[PDB]
Amino acid sequence: VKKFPEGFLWGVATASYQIEGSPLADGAGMSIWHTFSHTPGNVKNGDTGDVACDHYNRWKEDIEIIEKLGVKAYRFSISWPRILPEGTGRVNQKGLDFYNRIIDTLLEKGITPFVTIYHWDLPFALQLKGGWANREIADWFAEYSRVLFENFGDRVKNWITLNEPWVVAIVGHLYGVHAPGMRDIYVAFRAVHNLLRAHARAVKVFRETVKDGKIGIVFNNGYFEPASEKEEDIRAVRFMHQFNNYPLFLNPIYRGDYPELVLEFAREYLPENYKDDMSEIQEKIDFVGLNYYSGHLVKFDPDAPAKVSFVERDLPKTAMGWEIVPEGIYWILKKVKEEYNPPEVYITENGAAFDDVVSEDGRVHDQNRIDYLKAHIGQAWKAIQEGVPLKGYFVWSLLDNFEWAEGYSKRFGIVYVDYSTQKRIVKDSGYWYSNVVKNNGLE
Ligand SMILES: N=[N+]=NCCCCNC(=O)[C@@H]1[C@H]2[C@H](O)[C@@H](O)[C@H](O)[C@@H](CO)[C@@H]12
Numbered sequence: 001v002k003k004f005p006e007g008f009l010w011g012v013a014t015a016s017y018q019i020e021g022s023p024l025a026d027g028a029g030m031s032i033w034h035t036f037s038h039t040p041g042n043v044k045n046g047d048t049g050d051v052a053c054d055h056y057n058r059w060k061e062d063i064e065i066i067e068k069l070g071v072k073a074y075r076f077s078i079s080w081p082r083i084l085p086e087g088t089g090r091v092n093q094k095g096l097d098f099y100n101r102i103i104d105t106l107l108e109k110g111i112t113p114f115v116t117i118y119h120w121d122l123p124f125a126l127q128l129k130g131g132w133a134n135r136e137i138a139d140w141f142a143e144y145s146r147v148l149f150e151n152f153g154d155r156v157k158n159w160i161t162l163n164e165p166w167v168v169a170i171v172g173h174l175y176g177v178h179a180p181g182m183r184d185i186y187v188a189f190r191a192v193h194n195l196l197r198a199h200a201r202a203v204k205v206f207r208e209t210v211k212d213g214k215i216g217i218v219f220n221n222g223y224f225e226p227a228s229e230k231e232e233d234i235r236a237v238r239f240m241h242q243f244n245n246y247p248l249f250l251n252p253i254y255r256g257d258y259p260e261l262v263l264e265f266a267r268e269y270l271p272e273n274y275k276d277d278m279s280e281i282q283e284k285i286d287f288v289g290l291n292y293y294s295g296h297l298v299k300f301d302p303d304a305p306a307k308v309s310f311v312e313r314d315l316p317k318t319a320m321g322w323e324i325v326p327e328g329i330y331w332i333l334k335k336v337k338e339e340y341n342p343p344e345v346y347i348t349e350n351g352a353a354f355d356d357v358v359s360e361d362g363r364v365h366d367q368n369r370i371d372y373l374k375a376h377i378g379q380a381w382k383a384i385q386e387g388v389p390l391k392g393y394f395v396w397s398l399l400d401n402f403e404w405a406e407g408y409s410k411r412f413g414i415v416y417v418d419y420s421t422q423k424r425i426v427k428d429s430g431y432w433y434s435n436v437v438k439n440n441g442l443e
């Protein structure tokens with residue numbers, strides 16, 4: 001038996017573009033994901049978020065799935081261009097009406113909402129003016145954040161500013177694989193900096209607008225291990241963890257500068273007087289959300305950019321090709337405790353894509369996702385026993401959804417979605433997870 005502490009929060013998560021559909025309904029502006037996904041070559045099979053799971057219409061059913069399973073929290077995101085179609089200015093009252101209903105229904109069913117302000121659907125109008133690359137995004141971001149705090153902050157007490165600013169900056173502006181689809185390292189390191197400026201302004205504004213709330217920020221994390229015991233590979237790891245994981249952002253938030261290795265690689269790519277913004281950046285946060293999926297073996301390589309390369313291993317992998325290493329989640333949780341000692345941590349997303357099929361019985365037998373989930377939950381349990389202040393754990397995702405540049409070829413849900421019909425079927429992992437929730441852990 002591995003029983004979690006009293007009042008531990010068991011959650012599921014989603015993001016707005018991945019599940020809602022109806023991106024230009026009821027007054028909404030275009031986002032950078034509507035434009036990107038409508039560009040040929042960007043997304044496998046030419047999928048887009050145009051219909052998705054049609055949550056825009058099916059929300060009440062989907063809430064009803066959460067309640068029926070007895071899951072107690074629900075992290076979802078808010079689409080900025082549904083709220084402000086031009087990014088700033090006139091409010092789209094029908095965008096508010098969409099989220100108010102959701103939120104009211106969660107509250108009447110006893111489900112604690114956790115709201116992500118930004119999970120990648122930047123308004124297109126703001127992209128035309130530089131998007132994340134423009135220092136003025138901090139002000140666009142605060143204006144937008146305040147509309148949300150003012151309209152929902154009476155009922156929503158648990159807030160996340162950014163989902164995975166590493167991904168927004170680096171995948172969106174250096175690799176060019178996510179919206180806005182750009183490949184320029186100098187812009188990329190501007191976006192990193194500006195996401196920090198933006199976060200910190202929203203938290204400021206949070207303190208002036210919400211009573212009795214908590215506000216945090218979410219980071220992607222991988223478990224980097226070294227390829228040999230060479231000090232060069234052990235240093236490859238130190239760089240990967242500083243660059244790709246939470247420190248890239250927590251060194252500034254808790255220390256007042258970028259991490260050391262990061263600065264060795266990149267000082268030239270960051271704005272001139274970047275350090276002048278650091279004081280404002282240390283606006284006090286209430287928690288750290290960690291997202292965790294996979295592990296990577298890493299070596300020093302001088303040919304490679306940033307002098308590091310990945311090394312394939314023969315471990316089980318998911319449909320994404322992600323090596324499954326459940327002790328990574330224990331390690332990231334001990335390390336964030338040891339490094340920056342935040343007063344509260346959540347696991348804001350953990351889960352896995354496998355090629356789910358429906359059987360002749362009309363069920364989805366996904367023991368592969370149960371195995372994955374059990375091993376990670378057991379590992380998180382162990383981190384709590386060792387003193388990590390882990391307050392909750394959210395499964396990515398409630399529903400099969402639009403998996404970014406992968407389209408609908410990758411199914412991460414605990415609820416199967418037939419896209420022909422929009423039928424929801426609860427997977428075996430959904431039923432399992434429901435009993436984890438009931439028993440407050442593993443049995
Ligand atoms: N090198 N490197 N890092 C690249 C991998 C970073 C992890 N982030 C993501 O892929 C997105 C994040 C998002 O919250 C969610 O909307 C996505 O559905 C999941 C993907 O299943 C994860």
Ligand SMILES: [Cl-]
Pocket residue numbers: 028029030085124
């Ligand atoms: Cl528009």
Ligand SMILES: [Cl-]
Pocket residue numbers: 133134135136
């Ligand atoms: Cl600028």
